[PDB]
Every structure is written in structure tokens, then in C-alpha cells.
């Protein structure tokens, strides 16, 4: 019985890896050594991420994985066997997809319920803070868990702004509401 | 001289796989044995499905087949023997004769891969 | 400090024979090959019904320039 569903899209091999270290506890261990390969991919981006191609090998893909843990001694213990799975399953090229949403289960285990407060343009950040207050302020969030936010900038809206989290929003913007005046007035 | 090994990875009806090691993938139509307790069976290399995974048409009867039998590269196309010998004598597709003949022999072995 | 030098001089190096007289601008590995066709990954340039030539001496051209490969 797991956490939010990968179902489906290739979240499954991090699904199977959730719930396999999710019997023998070390999950944020195994969470911080993805953070880590990952921003070790990233510190090194010629060929730690151009190096992520299907036309290299069996043997080469398992050559850098091995190169990959020779930086680093014991890298956790499940998340250094997993590569060598998906380096034998070649699905190596959908790998830092797997980083996000290993990311995703993770802070859902901790319940940053990530939402977002979509405008055309950045705001202050008074209302920033009233907001997100708000909402760690409601129904929404039960509380014992936490809630990031995020403003965005968005042309293809006319203004206002948009609240947004478990898959549960509310728009009171410009552009939806020039709409509905327009729709009732154009009949 | 080194011979090249493969592991069939997959009988799929009437069509084989095999899985070889890097640096050892033969080229197409490069025929391959496999040795049953039966007798040899010939392999014909059709496609290269990539990572050093190659799809053969089978010669004989892929009944039989455990996954992960060792097959045997012989480097060239199937090879028949031509000239003056093989006259009169009945020949099927991979050159062993079965008119209990004896075998044939002929100083030349010919593939059956030409332009 | 020295060893993220020694992983990329090892990894740049480990597949040299790969990694270079490469990068794809106009070379290219045959990923898989069946049928008289072949499926090429790289060749970030090529346009489309442009000759290309192999190694072992047969010309082809590119038709399909998908994504992932040629």
C-alpha cells in the first residue's frame, strides 16, 4: 500500500524501488543519494548527461555506472543495484525523470503538497506570505505536513492570479472572468 | 583461431534470437549452429535488433530449443558443395545430404549468397 | 576535489574511441540495422534525402529523421 500512484509512464521502476526500501526503512538515505548522483550528473555535464544515449553498449552503460560509483564508496545500497537493472534494462535515458518523481513520492511522504499561485507577472512578497499562510491556514493542507509555494509568471493570462494544489484550484484572475462577461453578453 | 558464442534469448514460434557478446555480431546472412542431441541445427542472421541482439529465421525444426543454448558462429553465409560431385545425389538446404550416400566431398564449398 | 577530475578524465577516456572522432555534428553509430534499412542514432545536422556514407563502403540515404535516430 503505497503512496501517491506512479501508474503506468515509467515511474515504476521508482515505485518498485519506493516500496522495496520502503520494508527496510532507508528511504531518505536512499533520497539524498539520488540528490546526490543527480547534481553529480549535473556538476559534470559533458557526457554525465550526454552519456545518457541508447547506442552505447550493455558493457559501456555498466562501465559508467561503475565509474559513477567510483566517486563515491557504498553508494547508499539499493540505489547503486537499481542502475545496474535498468543499465541491463538499457532504460538509462528516462533516469533523472525517475530523480523527480522519486523526489515527488519522497516530499509527498513528508506532505509538501506543492501548489502554485499562477499570475502574468512576479508579485511582492507580502502577498506571497498572506498566502501561503492562508493555505497552510486551511482545510486544504491538514496540517502535520507542509506547503511549498510557487508564483509563476503567465502571458497567455491576462492578470490576476490563480491558486493551485491537489489537483484543486480556484481562479479568480482577469482572463476567465472577461470570459464569462463575454459569453453572457454575446447571446 | 577464437569462436563466437551467443545465447538464445528467445524462440518465438519460428524465430530465434540470440544475445552475443560485444565486438562478435556477424554480419547478415551469416549462418549460425546450434548443437541438439538430435542433430545440428542451422540458424540464418536476418536482422540486428541492437545491443548485441540478433533475429535469425530457423532451418530445421526450432522445436526443442531451452533458452540460453550456446550457439556457434560459422563466420560466412550456408555453405554447399558444388562441382562434379554432387551429382546425382539429393541435397537439402544446409548441404547434408540425406540419400545415406555418405557424405559429400568437394574441393570447394560455395555460399549461397552471391551479387 | 581530484577524483571528480579523475571520473571525467576516466569517463571522457573510457569511451574515447566513442566519444571521439564524434559528437554527432556529422557522424553517427548504426543502432540497428534489418530489412535494408538502418536506424542511426546521431547525426545532428543531416538533412533529410542527404547521402550518407558508411565504413565498409555502401551509400544510403535518410529518410526518417525522427527523434531519437535516423
Redesign the interface.
Known amino acids: 500500500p503505497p503512496p501517491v500512484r506512479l501508474f503506468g509512464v515509467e515511474g515504476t521502476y521508482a515505485t518498485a524501488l519506493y516500496q522495496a526500501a520502503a520494508k527496510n526503512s532507508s528511504i531518505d538515505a536512499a533520497f539524498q543519494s539520488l540528490q546526490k548522483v543527480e547534481s553529480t550528473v549535473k556538476k559534470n555535464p559533458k557526457l554525465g548527461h550526454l552519456l545518457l544515449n541508447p547506442a552505447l553498449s550493455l558493457k559501456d552503460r555498466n562501465s559508467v555506472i561503475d565509474a559513477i560509483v567510483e566517486t563515491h564508496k557504498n553508494l547508499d545500497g539499493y540505489v547503486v543495484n537499481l542502475l545496474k537493472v535498468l543499465s541491463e534494462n538499457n532504460r538509462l535515458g528516462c533516469f533523472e525523470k525517475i530523480a523527480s518523481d522519486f523526489g515527488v513520492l519522497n516530499d509527498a511522504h513528508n506532505g509538501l503538497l506543492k501548489g502554485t499561485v499562477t499570475s502574468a507577472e512576479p508579485l511582492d512578497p507580502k502577498s506571497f506570505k498572506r498566502i501561503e499562510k492562508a493555505l497552510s491556514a486551511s482545510k486544504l493542507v491538514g496540517q502535520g505536513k507542509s506547503l511549498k509555494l510557487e508564483n509563476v509568471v503567465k502571458p497567455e493570462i491576462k492578470g490576476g492570479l490563480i491558486v493551485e494544489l491537489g489537483d484543486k484550484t480556484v481562479d479568480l484572475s482577469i482572463s476567465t472572468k472577461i470570459q464569462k462577461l463575454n459569453k453572457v453578453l454575446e447571446d | 583461431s577464437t569462436p563466437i558464442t551467443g545465447k538464445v534469448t528467445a524462440v518465438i514460434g519460428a524465430i530465434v534470437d540470440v544475445h552475443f557478446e560485444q565486438s562478435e555480431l556477424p554480419a547478415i546472412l551469416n549462418a549460425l549452429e546450434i548443437k541438439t542431441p538430435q542433430g545440428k541445427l542451422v540458424l540464418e542472421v536476418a536482422q540486428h535488433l541492437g545491443e548485441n541482439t540478433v533475429r535469425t529465421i530457423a532451418m530445421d525444426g526450432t522445436e526443442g530449443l531451452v533458452r540460453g543454448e550456446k550457439v556457434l558462429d560459422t563466420g560466412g553465409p550456408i555453405s554447399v558443395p558444388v562441382g562434379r560431385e554432387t551429382l546425382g545425389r539429393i541435397i537439402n538446404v544446409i548441404g547434408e545430404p540425406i540419400d545415406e550416400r555418405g557424405p559429400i566431398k568437394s574441393k570447394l564449398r560455395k555460399p549461397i549468397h552471391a551479387d | 576535489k581530484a577524483?571528480?577530475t579523475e571520473?571525467?578524465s576516466?569517463?571522457?577516456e573510457?569511451?574515447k574511441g566513442?566519444?571521439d572522432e564524434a559528437n554527432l555534428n556529422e557522424t553517427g553509430?548504426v543502432?540497428?540495422?534489418?530489412?535494408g534499412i538502418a536506424r542511426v542514432?546521431?547525426l545532428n545536422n543531416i538533412q533529410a534525402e542527404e547521402l550518407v556514407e558508411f565504413s565498409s563502403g555502401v551509400k544510403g540515404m535518410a529518410l526518417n529523421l525522427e527523434p531519437?535516430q535516423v
Not at chain 3, 31 to 35: E, F
Request: net charge neutral; charged share 20%.
Open positions: 577524483q571528480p571520473v571525467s576516466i569517463l571522457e573510457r569511451i566513442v566519444s553509430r543502432l540497428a540495422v534489418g530489412d542514432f546521431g531519437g
